[PDB]
């Protein structure tokens, strides 16, 4: 099987950078393919027989390489390319196809939107209780978040959530939820969620206080 | 339009079998290859195997042969695709393609598993501009649709935990609004569960 391994495996770069991304197939090749997937679609052809563009790519795109060494290039990074890119041999079988290289793009450092939830009536008279915790419009998505129960970190129970880059300002939300028993929850009165962030000197503290805040 | 339309999510036993479908149309069923590719975990795409329709012509996978089956029905321009002894190592999503890999389907996402379908309970997440929230926790089958009444909504990936998935989103609206207006929270699914909120 001709391995075909893509370097960088991720990488963000800012709108206008030029970026290049290669393919090395394990054995030689006559052609190479590419390939563009966006979070929740289907892979796209973006350039294929190694030169050629497929309809619709932009003529920023341009593909070169041979025999065993392949790559991509962007003269301009732009929003809507932000992507994985996927390189495929078809010159023989199996067919192969390379790990991805995933492209993000940089941004202006920015620090989360906290807001902390208690919880509902419903879920309280159901026997749990979960304290969610949202982390909105955040770059870079390297962020730590820790739950403080009176004063007390929990580890287990805490359930972290990412989302993909956000298409229009281009930065990371999370969303964290501690989950507790009915019973763990009254007896214990103040929930703080701190974030640890790249902006923060320090930490971005949300509380609330069980009674009355 | 040339659409290959593929069918949809499917949860099975480890030891079933599944068939997957790809009705394609728009285009000239017999004159391309029908191939179909394997989409795991993350990044990972393998080319399962590929059909020549009406001539019915394989061409496998060395690793996909045994558990493959690709068949095509000329007629109803349908390629298919059976998988059996399926286990959770064969959770993942599958395209058929066409035209050279130009064309590509929509996905089937399969999990196989044993663990129970579940419906989800949603909860309203009010505060103590105007942020807001619902959490849908504990449903097995991962697709589940979240909306809000119809921008600043915010939905997260799921997590899943003991066999149970967990999803929340967060809108952000401005205080003039809510609570004047309301804010609804639509969950479907998992369950055949169809949920509104507050």
């Known amino acids: 099987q001709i391995v075909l391994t893509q370097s960088p495996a991720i990488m963000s770069a800012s709108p206008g950078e030029k970026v290049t991304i290669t393919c090395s197939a394990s054995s030689s090749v006559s052609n190479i393919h590419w390939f563009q997937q966006k979070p929740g679609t289907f892979p796209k052809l973006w350039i294929y027989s190694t030169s050629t563009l497929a309809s619709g790519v932009p003529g920023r795109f341009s593909g070169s390489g041979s ?28 067919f192969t196809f390379g790990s991805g290289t995933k492209l993000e793009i940089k941004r202006a450092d920015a620090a989360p939107t906290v807001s902390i939830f208690p919880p509902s009536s419903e879920q309280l008279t159901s026997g749990g209780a979960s304290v ?46 501690l989950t507790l028993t009915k019973d763990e929850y009254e007896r ?10 790249k902006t923060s000197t320090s930490p971005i503290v949300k509380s609330f206080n069980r009674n009355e805040c | 339009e040339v659409q290959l339309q593929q069918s949809g999510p499917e949860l099975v036993k480890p030891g079933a079998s599944v068939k997957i479908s790809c009705k394609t149309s728009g285009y000239t069923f017999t004159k391309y290859t029908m191939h179909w590719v394997k989409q795991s975990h993350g990044k990972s795409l393998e080319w399962i195997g590929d059909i020549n329709p009406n001539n019915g012509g394989t061409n496998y996978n060395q690793k996909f042969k045994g558990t493959a089956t690709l068949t095509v029905h000329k007629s109803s321009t349908t390629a298919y695709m059976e998988l059996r002894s399926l286990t959770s190592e064969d959770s993942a999503v599958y395209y058929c393609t066409s035209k050279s890999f130009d064309y590509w389907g929509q996905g089937t996402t399969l999990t196989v598993s044993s ?35 119809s921008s600043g909504v915010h939905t997260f990936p799921a997590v899943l935990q003991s066999d149970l998935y967990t999803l929340s989103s967060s809108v952000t609206v401005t205080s003039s609004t809510w609570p004047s207006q309301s804010i609804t929270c639509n969950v479907a699914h998992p369950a055949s569960s169809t949920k509104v909120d507050k």
């Open chain 2, 115 to 149: 663990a129970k379908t579940t419906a989800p309970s949603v909860y309203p997440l009010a505060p103590v501009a105007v942020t807001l929230g619902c959490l849908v926790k504990g449903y097995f089958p991962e697709p589940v649709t979240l909306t809000w009444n």
């Open chain 1, 67 to 94: 025999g065993t060494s392949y790559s991509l290039t962007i003269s301009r990074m732009g929003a809507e390319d932000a992507a994985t890119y996927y390189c495929q041999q078809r010159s023989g079988y199996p």
């Open chain 1, 132 to 177: 969610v915790c949202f982390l909105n419009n955040f770059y870079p998505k390297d962020i730590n978040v820790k739950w403080k129960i009176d004063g007390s970190e929990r580890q287990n129970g805490v359930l972290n959530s990412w989302t993909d880059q956000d298409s229009k300002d281009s930065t990371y939300s999370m969303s964290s939820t």
């Open chain 1, 188 to 197: 214990h009165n103040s929930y703080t969620c701190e974030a640890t962030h």
